[PDB]
Amino acid sequence: SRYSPEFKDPLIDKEYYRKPVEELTEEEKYVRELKKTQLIKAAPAGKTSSVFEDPVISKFTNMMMIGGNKVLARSLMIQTLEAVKRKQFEKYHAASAEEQATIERNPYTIFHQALKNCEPMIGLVPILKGGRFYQVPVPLPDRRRRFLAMKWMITECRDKKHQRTLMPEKLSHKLLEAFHNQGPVIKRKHDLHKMAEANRALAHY
């Protein structure tokens, strides 16, 4: 890294700075006087203080990026969010006053809940025993569960089964499926859990 270990990561949070002094604790008062003597890394081009900043969608965009083409990756993302919103406005206008209350039209709420429905609680590890391989179940950390939900969704949309369908239509269709606990990605979660149940007797390895 071109940053010496002395450089600290920047904290981009407007609220963190406007917080009054009186509310601060003696520990939080020390952290603030300390950072005034520390070197701070330049803020990356990715994240800003904008009110529309979403770290989860920004991460999903990077996991879709091919060969540093962020413009294309982000274009696909915003086209998916627009396709999700238009599909829900079409379902909303076609519904009755009672069903309309249950129809979600916010694509960020759908995107977040769609991924949370795909996160696998437990996973498997390929372990070797006596020249023979047997998988072992293990709890998954929070980072790993969130990463696997985004990798399974992107992998499913890149599958060759989809013929000539553009990515914003594929991803929007899969997100709305997972939002309703349906789809291939939800099945992958269920299969991983079901396999991790058939190997419970192998938890001692």
Binding site: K129, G130, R132, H204, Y205
Partner: protein
């Protein structure tokens, strides 16, 4: 003459009876196949062999019984397809007699190249030119490196001196091509002092040439008898009727293990000759078998009568493993 090995046991074991259809995956000379068509005149039988000369014998012998014997040609792996063309995919074969090894005719005829004692082309190939591109033992020895050829001898020949007997072959081939049986035998002997030529002994305690383990090793790598034996047994099981008696004959340990580990479900990747002590040590580490698909008619391997061994020393090591499908 070569009497069919353990013919009395194999006949009693399969108890051929009217209304039963049987298969024979190794017709060869046909001594066993004919002993089975004698007890039951109403029997139905199917034959198979890898040797076209053996398949011609069956065709010539088909005259004796027009339909009771049906001759087929091909390897164990190709047997299912050949029999699938007939359409007997379920098969419901009452018994499959999978005799193993080299035919008496194959190794009594010097031209076939199986006998080190005689002088024939170094073929050592059960195939009789049905596939003229199939490598012969001469090709195997002239091409493979010391490490590669040593493995053939070590794994298939049970030969301690695999590096010593393989280096001699590598040096000899460079000087001249290895194309005759005696030429190879002399090369293998030349790896050891001259007295070594007959130091080794068989279980019969009769002196054997010091290259009897290289002729067996190549014989099994040229004809891939071991890998073809696993598919051959598997195919028999699929084509074997429930309640049908299988009978194999293993003349050496490597084939005997596969038959034992197949009729008992034991994994083929387990360690050989495991003692009770080692079995305890193996499982103690993990602490931190599937239902059998066979019912062994005779629990322990049968063997030829000692008197019969002297009459037919070639079959001394015949280990008969009988089982009934489950």
């Amino acid at each position: 003459l070569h009497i069919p090995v353990m013919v009395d046991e194999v006949v009693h074991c399969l108890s051929p009876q009217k209304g039963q259809i049987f298969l024979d995956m190794t017709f060869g000379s046909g001594g066993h196949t004919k002993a089975i068509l004698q007890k039951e005149s109403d029997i139905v039988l199917y034959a198979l062999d890898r040797d076209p000369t053996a398949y011609a014998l069956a065709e010539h012998l088909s005259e004796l019984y027009p339909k009771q014997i049906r001759a087929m040609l091909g390897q164990f792996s190709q047997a299912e397809a050949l029999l699938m063309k007939a359409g007997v995919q379920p098969g419901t074969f009452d018994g499959v007699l999978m005799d193993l090894g080299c035919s008496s005719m194959q190794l009594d005829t010097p031209e076939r190249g199986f006998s080190l004692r005689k002088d024939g082309p170094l073929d050592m190939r059960m195939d009789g030119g049905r596939y003229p591109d199939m490598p012969t033992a001469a090709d195997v020895v002239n091409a493979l490196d010391q490490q590669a050829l040593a493995s053939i001898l070590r794994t298939y020949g049970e030969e301690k001196h695999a590096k010593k007997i393989a280096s001699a072959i590598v040096q000899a081939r460079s000087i001249y091509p290895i194309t005759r049986t005696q030429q190879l035998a002399s090369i293998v002997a030349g790896a050891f002092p001259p007295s070594a030529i007959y130091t080794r002994k068989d279980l019969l305690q009769r002196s054997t040439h010091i290259a009897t383990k290289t002729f067996q090793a190549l014989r099994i790598f040229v004809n891939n008898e071991l890998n073809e034996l696993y598919t051959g047994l598997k195919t028999a099981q699929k084509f074997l009727r429930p309640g049908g008696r299988l009978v194999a004959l293993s003349f050496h340990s490597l084939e005997d293990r596969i038959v034992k580990r197949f009729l008992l479900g034991i994994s083929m990747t387990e360690r050989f000759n495991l003692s009770v002590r080692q079995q305890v040590m193996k499982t103690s580490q993990l602490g931190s078998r599937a239902p059998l698909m066979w019912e062994l008619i005779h629990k322990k391997v049968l063997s030829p009568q000692d008197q019969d061994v002297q009459d037919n020393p070639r079959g001394r090591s015949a280990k008969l493993r009988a089982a009934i499908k489950l």
